[PDB]
Design a protein around this ligand. Structure first.
Ligand SMILES: [Fe+3]
Ligand SMILES: [Fe+3]
Ligand SMILES: [Fe+3]
Ligand SMILES: [Fe+3]
Lengths: 305, 492, 83, 101, 492, 305, 83, 101
């Protein structure tokens, strides 16, 4: 029998909130319907290939929680506010490019710095694209839309960094046409020893298909390692070589990185509400840390030589 | 100074490398990537024709949303909800329910490409595609939200995809098949090319024209803005198709397009067909559903398909005939079983509407008119028991939509059946049965709502049991005639 | 003896699920299908209602039962008028 | 056969949504495509603008007809769809077919 | 990190210094500054209560315009021009003509303060005020522009202030007196306080309500957005007034407010009065002109005037009575001399409208109704010669508006005359004559349109000669009855 | 007699343009009605005080032209596009403030630089406010709206610079509380010899009431002098004292200054269409140049000591 | 002999410019003012039309001319009905 | 005398133009002013919101009721007018009278 019920002030799933649903709540929460039916994530044959993939790599993950949808981005970003924020930051970066170019900044760098950039900076486009691809993977596998949304924005941020790197590689090559800038990055990513630790780490991370292990390895191991052992040391080196643009550029990128850290730590906190998860997360961290450390070491020694 | 995009664009997509620590096939597994054995180096020639870059994207998308929200805000007091014809309101309810959370699902289609496409340019454009679909899902939850307080049926803007309501199952079966349930290249071809360069124009622009005629500019402005993103990210399919043809995979490519177009057609004619030819008030019908089909699908999409080097689908003549007939029967089925829908279908069969129908579809009155004559009589004579069903329609094992035909004077109806692994399946067309045969493992153990009903999964096994199964939560949520049958007062 | 079939009625627009009985005759089948069709979407008419396998040309004898027909559950049948 | 005739066209060009770009684009299509007849179908929510085989819109002309500074990338704000294949750069956008039906 | 505005705001207005190379009086001459002998140091305590700063201003004003233009763009095809009642269209024509170029003139009022105000805070807020008025003038030229192609009367959005049309002379005499023709402090008091915190709410918000009821959201959205700027920059007058009172200039301050309120009232009742009670379709009249007056002028502005320490103007009772009567006669004068206006006045005297008029102004039918009865009869009997004037109205030497009274049963009309330097002037009120007497050198040699007519400056000295003098350029530009008298068909 | 005439495509005064009227044309051109009646600029008694003021200081100016309204801002800025442009530039400046503050930039300046800032930078708020007041004067007196519009935007730019200066004065005082920052600028503007040349120049310029002489002295003499002898030397000094923020800030301000130069040169060009004007402009330049040069000299020697 | 006056007619809503003649009588004045009023905004009525200085109480003798009245050009007069 | 009674009020508060700020401001007025009756007059194009003597709107409450990040200065986008004198800072806006009529 069907009762009469009044209109609700918000979605049925939010109607029990005490607080007035925010823009973020209204547009972000509980959107993955593919988690509703354990036997059939997607509305197809229960054993269709993508159904088997999700049952194995999402549903069966050792990282477990009875309410992933309750996760909340501490920054509560939606598409609209992300673009407002990033238009501000990217507009500022583009203005730095413009003004520093007017002042012929690149001609004033210390002798040979173009060679260090060509070796240690421009091939970063491969690394950042790996982070982009990987962020996209976590997005599609994550068991809650509020989690996936952080991953979408993270994927876009990775492309942002990739684009910064592409623009600056080309620009630098205009002042320094004989350093391989824009020409040899692929060879360096494939063959140069300083890049081999990073490339091995990403190739393997990109084949960690469990959503939980993908998340932990990408965001808790790889990305913090890139902050401490790549971004920061590059700023230090730039200072010593009279590159005053790169430190400012990296500071903008570091804002994105710190935001990724914020949602990541927020998810961990939500995940630790289940005691079993502590061991699951530590084990993945322990498993991936060696490769990360080796990646950082190879990179730093290539940088300091 | 700044340097022009043309001078640095190549480096943004110079992102392919030769894997060493895992194999290429491990990095791009065929089940997720769909590269069809084509090696990495061959994909580096993929050239997306509608480019953008990160700084431009955030700048321009900020401007798109500023306007979408500004117009909504300025028109809040326009009385659209109170002053609109009920059939227009149902159009909004059906649109938002069928579309909002689906846009969000389309993010995963784009993510599948962003990770698993072997084409560097595809992976970047799909990253912007991920963002676009996030935008679309968020807009189309935010926009209907304010109406929750007015009508529980607007709750379905969020709820539809979480339910087992029949139309929602039909949408999910189709979209999980072309968006979320296949490899990156199938997505590129089945979604970005086949669905997003043809059919979506019907719902987001054809409908926008009707909405403008109906004076609903908040809605018209919204959906046309959304389609400007689509026009960019949908351009990922063409290059992929050309690359497939150049690497000797024409046959496989053609099969994917053939399948996607048909599946899109069947589903989109159950939603957009009734809206355009029945729910939308007569004076707001910019063009008929068939006219829009000939503009957007035959005239625009078909011609584009031919320009890229593919052939008209094998079922082309079947398709053309279907355009004359299918949706009139879909409308009748949706209206007669209105209680199973989360919107209120308008019958749209007053004499003045029937004259328009006859003009747009010569013969209409001697076919569907025959059924509507019987229905109209029952209403006029207050025999309402005969205007509601006491059983279920038989349902296609592919499209998940009732099995229909041409009623009336030249009655013609056909079911296409199939035995497979000791099970009997029924389909509403030759093409639908063919689709099943192209990839049985995708479909074979899926049970349509009626299979579930007969298998004891719907308890109680009654029409009320099926309604609760379909996720309805109150009496108000279930569909009824949009005008409470007031239309009969014009049939005297 | 509950026996589900899918049935298309002459001049209607769809095929419906009608649950008949294993021991019903073709005349009683026709009647049960007609309940969900005639006077709902199909105009009443004079003549004899006959049952046949979907789009088949051979009609089932009026007195034949379901059990004697060889029909399986969930198969499709048409209900048409003698011509 | 209405469908064959519908299919046998070589119409290319922008579909511009309702707003401040409609008239400037129509005017621009006329100016930047001398000797091409420009056809316009008005659907209120959008306008379908076409020529045979090829249709160019230059940034320079569009800025002039719009009456305010304009960057080619911005057309996307109002370009709701298009017929033909597209070739776009900082200076113009070209809608065109490879084949002739 | 950023530091909060409160921590650095003081330095933005720490801009007063002690002149040494010219005298203080040379830097701030009384005729341009109006400091009334109050020394620099005393003005440093001026504290603007509605602050902004440069970074916030450009950011926020960018957002205001983004929305104003977005809404206009999205509603271009709404058919406002074609589908609106002709009286609404006339409201637009009269508004844009009376306001657009005047907004631009208000920039000079704000510039006068920005340069010649002795208060540092005033000079900065006036800089933002300059910008606001630039915005308003540009918006209100841009918005009507598209209608030029439809109707030459919209040319008056630009042309009005360049002409000698009588209403335009009335507007210029008043606004050149309070905006562009006096010292910085008079501007602060007469414009920002007296005009911009009371009367402008009538035209930009009262009218917005009517526009919303009339379904014209492009217009309602525009003018309400414009008024958000006004609410900020109008707050320059209050502090100046308080400072004047604290430095013993209460009397001078009170005189300035008394004069500005009355002059504003007379002019604004010739434009807004007829719009609200006659041109706006009956069903779109949110409130009557008098009701809006009591909301915005008596209820809001008056109370604010009292809170700042000033008194009700001496003419308060005269004002209240005027609100019951003046505009009904102004409307009649504008309509009967419609050919001299650049918009098409609606008579607004169908029976249903006359019932509303009687409710809102008990007695109306036994007064103005008497004249409208005679007019209506002439129309019904096709005696059109009697519905057009063959002479000029007598015109106030202050307000530049025809001299009027109460017609009908209790006929009462009064002209207040004055000899001055061997010339005879006539005024429409005691207050208007008083204003003249407060500052004769501002006014003494001005010649109103009728003085010009009698002095031979209008050739030929005929009604057609005066029309060409008033700047009309074609037959289409001249005002006629908004509905071509169709309203008479309801008086049968 | 009145003829019938068709609706026009734009304002009657623009209907004779061959080119389609732009946004700029539509909203900027021929808006001063006060120039229509030579005997009565304003609709008042012809000899009312403000009528006498305008007849003397605008109409009777020695700088003459039969069509001032034909002047065109080479940048064709309107309110809308000015705010789009400046929100970009000011947003970028505000982001520099934010980031440089994060990096504690001010602690890293060369010893004693705070004293040079306190003496030679922070009192600039008086100078910029003088430019603001003066720009406002030219606005209200200029004989064409297209001229006045350039002046309005220029007035707002002056306030922009004033606000930059106020913000940075306060901020600097947080790191250097014992340098008089935010406390003594008025005394320095009034009494310090290095400011006396500037203050004498502005006090006199602000009493040049002829619109033509106001324009020439402000925009052709004073403002270019501030660019060459104040803005640029400050950047040079900042570089030598490890202030890397100030040069970037001044570069943004210099964009505004160069824009003022652009419309100014455009007006001169329009004015020179009348041969008589050459001598009028030169004479004003010659008249004001001495005071400008003395202002610059006093400032530069205060700066270099 | 062209003589401009401003005239308010009984029961009308405004004062208008009426150009009379120096040698007109008050009866002819009343007539010239009435032309621009009666049957336009003022209903016709029986009675004698009289002229007086604005809001004055003493009426001008009907046969008196403008020249004999002492009235100056551009002064205001009322036209009212004998009571 | 309708005018005296109209004049003898102590009503203060924001006039909010039609848009997304109307309901959040009404709600905010109710929350941030406990023990004050909030009156609302709806004129479609704008809403007149008032209390006796004083009305506060805090940024924090307004952000909460609006449902998105919000800075006090932004209220100006929608504050079309107001009754009372105004006192505004980064944390709130206060509408108030000095006198009591
Ligand atoms: Fe989408
Ligand atoms: Fe899409
Ligand atoms: Fe204004
Ligand atoms: Fe204003």
């Amino acid at each position: 029998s069907f009762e009469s019920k009044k209109p609700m002030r918000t979605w049925s799933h939010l109607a029990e909130m005490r607080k007035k649903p925010s823009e973020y709540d209204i547009v972000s929460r509980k959107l993955h319907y593919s988690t509703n039916n354990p036997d059939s994530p997607w509305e197809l044959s229960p054993d269709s290939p993508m159904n088997l993939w999700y049952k194995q790599y999402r549903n069966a993950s050792p990282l477990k929680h009875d309410n992933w949808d309750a996760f909340t981005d501490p920054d509560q970003l939606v598409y609209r506010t992300y673009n407002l924020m990033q238009d501000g930051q990217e507009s500022y970066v583009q203005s730095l490019f413009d003004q520093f170019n007017e002042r012929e900044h690149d001609q004033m760098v210390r002798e040979g710095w173009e060679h260090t950039m060509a070796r240690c900076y421009s091939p970063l486009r491969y690394l950042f694209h790996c982070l982009q691809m990987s962020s996209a993977y976590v997005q599609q596998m994550a068991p809650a839309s509020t989690i996936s949304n952080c991953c979408i924005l993270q994927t876009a941020d990775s492309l942002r960094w990739l684009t910064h790197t592409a623009y600056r590689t080309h620009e630098l090559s205009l002042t320094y046409p004989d350093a391989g800038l824009g020409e040899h990055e692929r060879e360096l990513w494939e063959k140069e020893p300083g890049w081999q630790g990073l490339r091995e780490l990403m190739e393997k991370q990109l084949t960690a298909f469990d959503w939980g292990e993908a998340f932990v390895s990408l965001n808790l191991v790889v990305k913090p390692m890139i902050v401490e052992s790549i971004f920061k040391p590059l700023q230090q080196q730039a200072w010593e070589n009279n590159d005053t643009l790169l430190p400012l550029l990296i500071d903008s990128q570091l804002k994105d990185a710190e935001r990724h850290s914020r949602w990541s730590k927020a998810l961990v906190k939500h995940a630790l509400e289940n005691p079993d998860n502590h061991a699951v997360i530590e084990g993945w961290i322990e498993k991936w840390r060696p490769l990360a450390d080796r990646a950082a070491e190879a990179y730093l020694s290539m940088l300091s030589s | 100074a700044m340097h022009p995009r043309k001078d640095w664009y190549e480096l943004t997509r110079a992102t392919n490398w030769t894997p060493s620590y895992v194999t290429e096939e491990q990095l791009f597994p065929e089940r997720m990537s769909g590269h069809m054995g084509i090696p990495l180096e061959k994909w580096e020639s993929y050239d997306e024709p509608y480019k953008t870059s990160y700084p431009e994207y955030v700048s321009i998308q900020r401007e798109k949303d500023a306007g979408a929200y500004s117009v909504k805000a300025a028109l809040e007091r326009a009385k659209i909800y109170e002053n609109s014809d009920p059939g227009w309101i149902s159009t909004l309810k059906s649109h938002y329910g069928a579309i909002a959370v689906l846009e969000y699902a389309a993010v995963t289609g784009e993510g599948r490409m962003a990770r698993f496409s072997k084409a560097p340019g595809n992976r970047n454009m799909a990253t912007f595609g991920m963002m676009d679909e996030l935008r679309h899902g968020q807009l189309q939850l935010f926009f209907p939200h304010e109406y929750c307080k007015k009508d529980r049926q607007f709750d379905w803007a969020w709820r539809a995809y979480h339910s087992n309501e029949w139309a929602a199952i039909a949408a999910k079966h189709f979209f999980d098949d072309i968006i979320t349930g296949r490899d990156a290249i199938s997505v590129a071809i089945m979604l970005t090319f086949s669905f997003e360069t043809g059919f979506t124009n019907m719902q987001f622009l054809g409908l926008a024209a009707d909405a403008a005629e109906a004076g609903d500019y908040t809605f018209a402005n919204l959906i046309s803005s959304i389609q400007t993103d689509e026009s960019r990210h949908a351009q990922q399919g063409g290059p992929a198709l050309q690359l497939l043809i150049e690497n000797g995979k024409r046959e496989e490519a053609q099969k994917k397009v053939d399948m996607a177009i048909w599946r899109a057609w069947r589903l989109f004619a159950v939603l957009t067909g009734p809206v355009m030819d029945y729910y939308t008030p007569l004076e707001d019908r910019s063009q008929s559903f068939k006219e829009f089909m000939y503009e957007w699908i035959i005239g625009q999409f078909e011609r584009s398909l031919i320009d890229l080097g593919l052939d008209k689908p094998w079922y082309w003549d079947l398709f053309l005939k279907d355009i004359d007939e299918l949706h009139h029967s879909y409308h009748m089925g949706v209206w007669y079983w209105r209680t199973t829908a989360w919107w209120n279908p308008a019958a749209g069969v007053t004499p003045e509407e029937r004259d328009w129908l006859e003009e747009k579809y010569p013969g209409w009155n001697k076919r569907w008119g025959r059924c509507w004559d019987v229905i109209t009589e029952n209403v006029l004579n207050d025999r309402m028991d005969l205007v509601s069903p006491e059983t279920l329609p038989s349902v296609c094992n592919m499209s998940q939509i009732p099995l229909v035909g041409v009623p009336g004077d030249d009655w013609n109806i056909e079911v296409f059946s199939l035995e497979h692994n000791g099970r009997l399946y029924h389909f509403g067309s030759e093409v639908d049965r063919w689709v099943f045969q192209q990839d049985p493992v995708q479909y074979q153990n899926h049970m349509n709502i009626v299979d579930r009903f007969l298998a004891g999964q719907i308890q109680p096994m009654t029409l009320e049991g099926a309604l609760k199964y379909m996720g309805f939560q109150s009496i108000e949520e279930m569909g009824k005639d949009a005008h409470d049958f007031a239309w009969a007062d014009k049939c005297k | 003896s509950a026996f589900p079939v899918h049935a298309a009625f002459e001049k209607d627009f769809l095929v419906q699920l009608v649950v008949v009985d294993l021991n019903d005759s073709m005349d009683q089948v026709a009647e049960k299908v007609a309940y969900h069709c005639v006077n709902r979407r199909v105009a009443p008419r004079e003549g004899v209602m006959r049952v046949r396998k979907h789009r088949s040309t051979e009609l089932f004898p009026r007195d034949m039962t379901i059990a004697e027909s060889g029909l399986n559950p969930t198969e499709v049948i048409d209900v048409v008028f003698e011509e | 056969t209405l469908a064959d005739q519908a299919l046998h066209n070589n119409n290319v060009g922008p579909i511009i949504r309702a707003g401040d770009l409609v008239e400037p684009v129509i005017e621009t299509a006329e100016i930047d495509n001398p000797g091409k007849e420009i056809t316009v179908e008005d659907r209120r929510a959008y306008v379908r603008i076409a020529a045979e085989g090829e249709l160019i819109l230059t940034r320079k002309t569009l800025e002039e007809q719009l009456g305010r500074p304009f960057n080619m990338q911005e057309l996307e704000i109002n370009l709701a769809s298009f017929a033909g294949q597209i070739q776009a750069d900082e200076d113009q956008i070209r809608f065109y077919f490879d084949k002739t039906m």
